[PDB]
Design a protein around this ligand. Structure first.
Ligand SMILES: *[C@H](CC(=O)O)C[C@@H](O)/C=C/C(C)=C\[C@H](C)C/C(C)=C/C=C/[C@@H](O)[C@H]1C[C@@H](O)[C@H](C)[C@H](/C=C/C)O1
Ligand SMILES: Nc1nc2c(ncn2[C@@H]2O[C@H](COP(=O)(O)OP(=O)(O)NP(=O)(O)O)[C@@H](O)[C@H]2O)c(=O)[nH]1
Ligand SMILES: [Cl-]
Ligand SMILES: [Cl-]
Ligand SMILES: [Cl-]
Ligand SMILES: [Mg+2]
Lengths: 199, 1014, 121
């Protein structure tokens, strides 16, 4: 049915932005620091049925850390996030992993290097090796471009359900049913974001 | 509500209510969970909450409540331990120790509350970090003794010891001063003989959960212990035999053995070499007999993902690669060891067939290590000839799609243009290519035979698939350079004959797309061949031109990329007149450029034009080259001329079609300028005057639009289109100037009209209408000719400095491009034309200092780094002036501003990325005073007259730190500053001292003698 | 969706307007299809996100809807939807939908309006 997922990593690495993208489809440009933790349910439809992740999106800023490792209690899986444009965030990966596995001794964990859409990459592909001895899955991702955005959830689902051929599927779409002026005019006259994007 | 009651410390703690709040948080959902979370965080953060810890541990029925109690204690121990009265310290130690003992002796608790016991153990370790051994000398002997009284206690003691080793050896560098880390490492080292004794005895006397815990501890010890503990005892036999047999112990044993393989070990000792061979031999024998034979299909096993098979196969890969990279020479000379060597490598071959990208990278790294060694070390390659032959097959069959191959199969089985770049396979391709290149050199006959026969089975249809032709084609392309020119010739001819057959035989847009992409990849990969076979090269190019009319957008785009890829390498053959041709091929291309590019998108047209510029720059005779350039630019120059008439008569608002035409003309110029560089000048000069006039006209259009429609006008397709014209004009000028060789013309002809056209327009537009590209263009201008235009640089500063600063000094995020370009501009001005800043009025020079410090405070690396560099360069610029009034006043006004601002970002924990450059700057500043390089007093009789700046500096800093960090003792501050000032000529030591200060400010009672570390 | 004919398909990015914040928020990128029900002849928009395949638009192309320009774009339409069920219970939204090109946006409008006539039959 459902699994507790903890999401950890340095402040500003894109944890919340990544979750939001999955929740609503949106890309939040602003950086509003998470305070302690935010819990969101997130459901995926698979060939093996629905899987629900209760996502505990934790604060990466030390000053907003709240219960810190207290959030990890009974997690069944995890994502460790860093930012490929910020070397300090990769340097801190072993610290996050240390704190996490001290509480969660045998869970599937994905390591994600976020923000690969940014041209000036700083954490070189070749350098990313921490996951190997720790048996973490690794993916380059971008919450902004959606590059590999589904990969961490697909992998975790396969591990959790115990089926390596599990796939996301389209669920059948139910037949839909059969001041306006002012609200529309406001929407018409607020520019769409990123008009230089391919889509 | 009810839950907030635990926050009222004036009343007794209702433990039941606490357990309800905790349960609501962990087991609840929605608003109630959210409220409960905030309450617990507030409770946790209460600086007296630790006083409740004992009560919670005693009375709670909720293990998560007790975890939280322990987190509360952890925070107290790590940050405020030495603030506590001595009886609170003794009491806390007693109840943590007691809780642990109590939980271990109850089998039910020990079995079911592992998380809580691990948390308790970690909390005990935090107390050890503070108290041990100086105020707890018998901890280890008593731990060892207590281990005999209970299997539970003994197992838990192994957990405690594992955590201590980690905290001391693996995670101390960031968390402890250099001196304290040394103390704890020395202390653990001195008692390790007895820790090991206990470890080895448990391991000898075989309880599985206890054994696993002991082995987990051993894994940590292996990070630092001397090798004699491993080689002078019987522990290697146990690890490589006994503990490999049971699956529960096998996982950890294998990781231990991997670390054993990394021990520091004498190189000249035959007995030790024998031992290193023996454990490997033992381990491989266990794998073969107890896990799987070398023939086993590990690909299949991994894909099944039963139990812990995936992690085990990963750890096996790590073990084999680690050992063999270090030790395979031990196995290479002795005939009796050959079978082991090859079986080990055969397992690796099997592991390399697993479908798991990251695991493949690990094994590929090993193969690279091997083949690079075989390439050089005499008499070795023959040993591995069969391994290498199998490896050739593996790599060829798993070649990732090259960056150049733009077509991919969609989920519906259609061959389509990729939506985006596969950015995460770039490194993978390079690594695969690297290994395959070595393998080709090692046996060119085998490689050719493999490729030519695989290709033959695509053609005859026996093995045909998109996947198969693709991996093969990519492989064939990737080995370009390995064969002799002569051997390559025959090989390429054979491959192309076959691929052309395949192209005739496999029809439909999908097949045609796949095969076209593969042939384009291959031909683009063999320029040496193209250069030697003009008739073939000409035929390839004409075929590419055909594809420029393809309705398949992926093929079409790839044709353009391949054209330029080929031209970049073969351009010389396009500029000469080839035997049996009437004209150089460049003439043929240019003559028919309208037809060839008719179906291309504008950006593809620009690429085509860019490729033509590459060719034309091969012509070194100026007359002939300028003629070719003129011919190339004929179409855009004719379109330009007609637009310059339609502007000359008007100016009114350009329609969107005209705006697009103009943008594309300029983009075409940019493209050609990019490849021709300094050679582009005659074309630039041809359009320049009218181009700057057009810049002004479009500028007035933009302004008029913002005036009539509001700021929202800047979002419209029309205004965005007009700004594109301005941006491309700026890009064209920047591109040219960045490559110009005639700087006299740049200054005399280009600069004055540019500045006249761009500067006032930037200054006098509203913020949202200002192009950051103006700043970028000016940076190149200053970089290339700044030394020659001192008044020009002044004008640039006057025009953009204050107004841009005001855009970016309200927060860290608005106008991100302006922000980044702004600081690049100031950097180059400070570097090349410092006199420009000397000329500023004092009020403006103050804004400059403010701007630099503002840069410091960014977390944005693109701003922070430049800010620090400017600060450093500025200090050097001032110092270079010597004892003159400007420098004296500079120091009087700003020395302490730079010192304190630098200290601030060093110490606030929000600018850790800039540590190295902050330290550098601080060291420079301190060394200025330490070297008496500041001529005037930095103080005003605020101190005795004649007081040295050294003395005043210490006083200022001690006061500054005393007020900013009141929890530090005066001696801590005094000792820190003494060390720091003494060390201002030795950056590595100076930084160590800064790092020690950063540790000490996070706690109370840090030892001042720590700053004596050396 | 086997009881449905695909009248039209196009790659698109869908936005929804958050009134409270004054901003457009992306809802999904993927194939926007116009589907005609073979039993009822009614034409809906159905759009699914790439990769996750999650529904980001599911609504009838009501005859009363009108496609309007967005001030920032020549390749987008904005319109009010009274009943979208992508997320579950029917809900009103102001949508914007952007395409790879103006040509695509103009084709979409043409097809959108054809679909509206069908829904009037
Ligand atoms: C599909 C079939 C076709 O012939 O069009 C091919 C299509 O998918 C793409 C072809 C591409 C991108 C390049 C071709 C290699 C260009 C051609 C057709 C070159 C032909 C050259 C012949 O003169 C060639 C025949 C062979 O005997 C060899 C290669 C000789 C070389 C002599 C030095 O010449
Ligand atoms: N360029 C780019 N920016 C991204 C990406 N993902 C997130 N961001 C940006 O990075 C910033 C921080 O994102 P956020 O999700 O708040 O980070 P966080 O890891 O949750 N921070 P905290 O741990 O403090 O709550 C935001 O401005 C966001 O838009 C990405 O993939 N690419
Ligand atoms: Cl617990
Ligand atoms: Cl050449
Ligand atoms: Cl003191
Ligand atoms: Mg966050």
């Amino acid at each position: 049915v459902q699994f507790k997922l903890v999401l950890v990593g340095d402040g500003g690495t894109g944890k919340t932005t990544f979750v939001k993208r999955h929740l609503t489809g949106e890309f939040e440009k602003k950086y509003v620091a998470t305070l302690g933790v935010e819990v969101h349910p997130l459901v995926f439809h698979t060939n093996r049925g629905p899987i629900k992740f209760n996502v505990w999106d934790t604060a990466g800023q030390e000053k907003f850390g709240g219960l810190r490792d207290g959030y990890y209690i009974q997690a069944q899986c995890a994502i460790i996030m860093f930012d490929v444009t910020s070397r300090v965030t990769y340097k801190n990966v072993p610290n996050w992993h240390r704190d996490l596995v001290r509480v969660c001794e045998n869970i599937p964990i994905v390591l994600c290097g976020n923000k690969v859409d940014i041209k000036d990459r700083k954490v070189k592909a070749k350098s990313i090796v921490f996951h190997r001895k720790k048996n973490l899955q690794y993916y380059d991702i971008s919450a902004k471009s959606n590059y590999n955005f589904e990969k961490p959830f697909l992998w975790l689902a396969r591990k959790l359900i115990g089926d390596p051929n599990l796939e996301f599927v389209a669920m059948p779409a139910l037949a839909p049913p059969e001041q306006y002026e002012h609200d529309l005019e406001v929407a018409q006259t607020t520019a769409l974001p990123d008009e230089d994007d391919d889509l | 509500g009810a839950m907030e009651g635990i926050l009222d410390f004036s009343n007794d703690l209702d433990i039941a209510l606490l357990d309800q709040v905790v349960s609501t948080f962990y087991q609840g959902s929605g608003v109630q969970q959210k409220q409960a979370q905030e309450i617990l965080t507030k409770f946790q953060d209460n600086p007296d909450a630790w006083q409740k810890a004992d009560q919670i541990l005693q009375f709670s029925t909720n293990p998560q409540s007790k975890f939280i109690a322990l987190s509360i204690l952890d925070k107290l121990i790590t940050r405020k331990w030495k603030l506590l009265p001595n009886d609170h310290r003794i009491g806390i130690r007693n109840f943590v120790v007691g809780m642990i003992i109590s939980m271990c002796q109850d089998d039910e608790v020990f079995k079911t509350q592992k998380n809580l016991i691990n948390k308790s153990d970690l909390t005990l370790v935090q107390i050890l970090k503070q108290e041990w051994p100086q105020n707890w000398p018998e901890f280890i002997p008593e731990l060892i003794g207590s281990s005999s009284s209970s299997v539970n206690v003994c197992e838990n003691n192994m957990i405690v010891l594992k955590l201590l080793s980690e905290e001391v050896f693996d995670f101390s560098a960031e968390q402890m001063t250099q001196a304290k880390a040394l103390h704890l490492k020395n202390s653990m080292s001195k008692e390790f003989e007895q820790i090991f004794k206990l470890c080895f005895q448990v391991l000898e006397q075989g309880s599985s959960s206890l054994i696993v815990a002991t082995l987990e501890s051993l894994l940590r010890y292996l990070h630092w212990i001397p090798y004699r503990y491993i080689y002078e005892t019987n522990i290697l036999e146990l690890l490589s035999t006994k503990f490999m047999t049971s699956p529960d112990t096998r996982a950890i044993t294998l990781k231990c053995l991997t670390e054993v393989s990394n021990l520091k070990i004498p190189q000249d000792n035959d007995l030790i070499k024998r031992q290193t061979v023996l454990f490997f031999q033992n381990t491989l024998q266990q794998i073969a007999t107890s896990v799987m034979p070398v023939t086993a299909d590990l690909k299949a096993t991994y894909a099944n993902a039963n139990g812990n098979d995936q992690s085990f196969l990963q750890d096996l890969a790590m073990f084999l690669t680690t050992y063999l990279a270090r030790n395979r020479a031990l196995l290479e000379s002795d005939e009796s060891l050959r079978e082991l060597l090859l079986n080990a490598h055969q397992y690796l071959i099997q592991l390399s067939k697993i479908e798991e990208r990251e695991l493949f990278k690990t094994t590929l790294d090993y193969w690279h290590n091997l083949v690079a060694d075989l390439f050089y070390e005499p008499l070795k390659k023959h040993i591995y000839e069969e391994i290498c032959s199998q490896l050739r097959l593996v790599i060829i069959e798993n070649m990732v799609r090259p960056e150049e191959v733009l077509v991919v199969e969609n989920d519906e089985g259609e061959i389509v243009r990729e939506f985006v770049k596969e950015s995460d396979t770039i490194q993978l391709y390079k690594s695969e290519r690297e290994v395959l290149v070595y393998l080709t050199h090692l046996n060119v006959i085998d490689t050719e035979e493999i490729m030519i026969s695989k290709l033959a089975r695509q053609i005859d249809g026996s093995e045909w698939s998109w996947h198969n032709i693709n991996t093969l084609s990519w492989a064939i392309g990737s080995i370009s350079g390995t064969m002799s020119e002569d051997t390559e010739k025959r090989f390429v001819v054979t491959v192309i004959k076959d691929l052309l057959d395949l192209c005739v035989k496999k029809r439909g847009k999908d097949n045609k797309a796949v095969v076209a992409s593969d042939i384009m990849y291959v031909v683009g990969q063999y320029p040496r061949f193209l250069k030697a076979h003009w008739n073939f090269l000409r035929t390839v190019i004409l075929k590419l031109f055909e594809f420029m009319h393809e309705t398949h957008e992926g093929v079409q785009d790839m044709a353009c990329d391949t054209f330029i890829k080929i031209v970049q390498k073969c351009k010389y053959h396009f500029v000469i007149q080839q035997p049996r041709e009437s004209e150089p091929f460049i003439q043929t291309i240019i003559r028919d450029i309208q037809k060839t590019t008719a179906d291309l998108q504008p950006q593809q047209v620009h690429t085509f034009y860019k490729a033509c510029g590459i060719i034309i720059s091969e012509e070194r005779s100026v007359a002939e080259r300028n003629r070719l350039l003129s011919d190339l630019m004929q179409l855009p120059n004719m379109a330009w001329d007609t637009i310059v008439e339609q502007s000359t008569a008007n100016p009114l608002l350009l329609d969107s079609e005209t705006v697009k035409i103009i943008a594309n003309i300029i983009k075409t110029n940019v493209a050609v300028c990019t490849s021709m560089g300094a050679d582009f000048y005659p074309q630039l000069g041809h359009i320049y005057y009218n181009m700057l006039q057009l810049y002004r006209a479009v500028s007035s259009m933009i302004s008029a639009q913002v005036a009539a429609e509001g700021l929202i006008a800047t979002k419209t397709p029309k205004v965005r289109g007009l700004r594109t014209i301005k941006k491309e004009i700026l890009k064209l000028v920047e591109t040219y100037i960045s490559k110009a060789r005639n700087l006299d013309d740049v200054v005399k002809v280009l600069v004055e009209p540019l500045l006249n056209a761009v500067l006032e327009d930037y200054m006098n537009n509203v913020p949202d209408a200002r192009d950051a590209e103006v700043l970028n263009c000016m940076t190149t201008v200053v970089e290339k000719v700044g030394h020659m235009i001192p008044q020009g640089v002044i004008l640039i500063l006057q025009s953009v400095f204050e107004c841009t600063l005001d855009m970016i000094n309200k927060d860290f995020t608005e106008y991100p491009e302006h922000r980044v370009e702004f600081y690049k501009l100031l950097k180059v001005i400070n570097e090349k034309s410092f006199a420009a800043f000397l000329e500023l009025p004092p009020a403006a020079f103050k804004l400059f200092v403010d701007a630099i410090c503002w840069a410091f405070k960014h977390n944005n690396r693109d701003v922070e780094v430049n800010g620090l560099q400017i600060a450093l360069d500025l200090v050097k610029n001032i110092e270079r002036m010597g004892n003159v009034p400007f420098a004296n006043e500079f120091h009087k006004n700003y020395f302490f501003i730079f010192v304190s601002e630098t200290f601030f970002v060093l110490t606030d924990s929000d600018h850790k990325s800039g540590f190295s450059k902050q330290a550098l700057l601080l060291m420079k500043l301190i060394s200025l005073v330490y070297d008496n390089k500041i001529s005037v007093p930095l103080y005003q009789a605020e101190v005795p007259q004649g007081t040295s700046n050294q003395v005043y500096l210490s006083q200022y800093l001690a006061n500054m730190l005393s007020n900013a960090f009141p929890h530090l003792t005066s001696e801590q501050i005094a000792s820190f500053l003494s060390a720091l000032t003494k060390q201002c000529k030795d950056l590595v030591v100076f930084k160590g001292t800064l790092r020690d200060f950063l540790v000490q400010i996070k706690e109370v009672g840090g030892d001042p003698t720590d700053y004596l570390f050396a | 969706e086997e009881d449905e004919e695909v009248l039209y398909k196009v790659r698109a990015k869908l936005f929804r307007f958050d009134k409270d914040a004054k901003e457009w928020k992306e809802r999904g990128t993927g194939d926007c299809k116009f589907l005609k029900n073979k039993k009822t002849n009614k034409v809906r928009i159905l759009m699914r996100r790439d990769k996750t395949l999650k529904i980001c638009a599911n609504h009838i192309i009501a005859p009363e809807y009108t496609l309007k320009p967005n001030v920032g774009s020549d390749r987008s339409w904005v319109y009010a939807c009274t009943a979208d069920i992508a997320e579950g219970e029917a809900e009103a939204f102001t949508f914007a939908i952007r395409f790879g090109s103006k040509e695509n946006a103009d084709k979409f409008k043409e097809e959108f309006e054809k679909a509206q006539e069908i829904n009037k039959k």
